[PDB]
């Protein structure tokens, strides 16, 4: 028999800073690098999927996940916490569709998912999520890219990077990224930003990449990743 704690594990310090959120921000900042780019006619999301051993089955688990027909997810930080947010976001997407009979606007999903992240910064007996989410989507004939973080705050991006070397990844994108890209060009600059922080040689198994357009969201097959790696 058990009964949970009813007191907040995230409190205000004398400085006025919620320490556990910034500590959760350290968990994502130390995780594997991820990059997202909004490119006029579509969105691309890419991440480092280096399992650091040849024993692993690279096909079993995925980091780039679909939420619905038109929305995808990538993360930096902890895998287990990310899974919870995926399952919650998939349910929120269906809850919206059952009520309105319309594919959920990306901005509306991120708002609903970020609100779940907010709970774990105030609710009793729980720690915040150690994950920053990268949400892509297509609705009203327009590409969307969003960032959700442990705080529960959300930001809209043209292009951004998170995880290891997120500071060097962003400055790279400031110079490299230009508006009005083609989707196929966006995959290149996504892998290029990922190469800046890699360490090792890139194979189609070492990285994972998903794309979102007017035809919906899908993860690129290992054969498709190999062709861009040249």
């Amino acid at each position: 028999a058990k009964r949970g704690y009813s007191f907040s594990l995230t409190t205000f310090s004398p400085s006025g800073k919620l320490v556990q959120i910034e500590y959760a921000l350290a968990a994502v900042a130390g995780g594997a690098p991820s990059v997202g780019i909004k490119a006029a006619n579509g969105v691309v999301l890419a991440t480092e999927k280096k399992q650091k051993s040849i024993l692993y089955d690279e096909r079993s688990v995925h980091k780039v996940e679909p939420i619905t027909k038109h929305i995808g997810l990538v993360y930096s930080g902890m895998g287990p916490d990310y899974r919870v947010l995926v399952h919650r976001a998939r349910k929120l997407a269906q809850q919206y569709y059952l009520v309105y009979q319309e594919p959920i606007p990306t901005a509306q999903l991120v708002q609903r998912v970020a609100s779940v992240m907010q709970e774990y910064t105030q609710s009793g007996g729980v720690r915040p999520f150690g994950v920053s989410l990268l949400i892509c989507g297509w609705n009203e004939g327009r590409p969307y890219l969003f960032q959700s973080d442990p705080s529960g705050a959300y930001f809209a991006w043209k292009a951004t990077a998170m995880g290891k070397n997120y500071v060097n990844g962003k400055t790279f994108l400031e110079k490299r990224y230009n508006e009005d890209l083609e989707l196929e060009d966006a995959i290149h600059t996504a892998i290029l930003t990922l190469k800046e922080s890699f360490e090792g040689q890139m194979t189609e198994d070492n990285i994972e990449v998903g794309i979102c357009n007017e035809a919906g969201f899908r993860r690129l097959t290992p054969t498709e990743v190999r062709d861009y790696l040249a």
């Binding site: 704690y5 205000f12 006025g16 901005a107 890219l145 705050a153 400031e174």
Partner: protein
Amino acid sequence: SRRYDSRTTIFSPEGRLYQVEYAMEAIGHAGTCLGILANDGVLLAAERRNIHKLLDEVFFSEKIYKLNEDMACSVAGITSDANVLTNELRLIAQRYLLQYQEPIPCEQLVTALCDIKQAYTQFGGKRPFGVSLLYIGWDKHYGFQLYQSDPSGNYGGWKATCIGNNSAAAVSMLKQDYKEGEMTLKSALALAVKVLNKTMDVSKLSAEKVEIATLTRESGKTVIRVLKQKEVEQLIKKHEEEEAKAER
């Protein structure tokens, strides 16, 4: 269990609440947000803290929220806690409408949320919302109104006020310039740009760095608009041109 309890809703030896006053410090590091009341309207002016070459700009605003047909608010503090409170403000405004079939009076909506925030300081053992809010609106009782909300759950009606970064410097600047009973919306818009320019950090002031929304009564209808970039550009440059005519 009690070993890990932070004891959030507890009294200090001096007779004050620590978590409330620690939350006040979070507001001080957030964006500068001011509200000014005029004769023919009321406005909000806030510093954008989300500024980058790579930000997309999807929404109409960053810190300014529409709560009601006749009411709008601005925010300073933790944005996620702000999103929770503003969503609740939209709910309470609609619950009143459903019951009485007329818009909620400005003071009453502020009162309702302040009771929720006060409850978080007394019971539950939870951290308070680290947000200060500025409400602007119009009701059929007191006309154009401006309100300020604290994380303590305490409120007050103002003619001109500010919360956020360099807040004490901004209010004393307003105390000197504000002309009670003579203030028009055009004068208040000019005062907003004047206060922001001296208060803000980056010095020169930009259309991407500030956010202004006006609330006016037009043709028997309350009109709320978030000012366009081309409008803000003229407001900054009109103060810039008067900065050049100040020397001889």
